[PDB]
Amino acid sequence: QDGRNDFYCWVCHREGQVLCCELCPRVYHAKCLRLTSEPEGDWFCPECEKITVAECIETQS
């Protein structure tokens, strides 16, 4: 019911030490991402945060 955060990290294709992302693949690695902090709730892996800071790369109208 917790969304089974355990599954497989695409970087290693193996399960173990993985965090749940809400804006990306239900499960992802924190080690491969080299994360030293453990956030709770909807966390954004550097991958989602990186594109979030760039915001709309193209100008609208």
Binding site: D2, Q17, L19, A30, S37, E38
Partner: peptide, 11 residues
């Protein structure tokens, strides 16, 4: 559940 991930409680 178990210690699947690190939970050192930053707080």
């Amino acid at each position: 559940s178990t210690g699947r991930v690190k939970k050192p409680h930053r707080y």
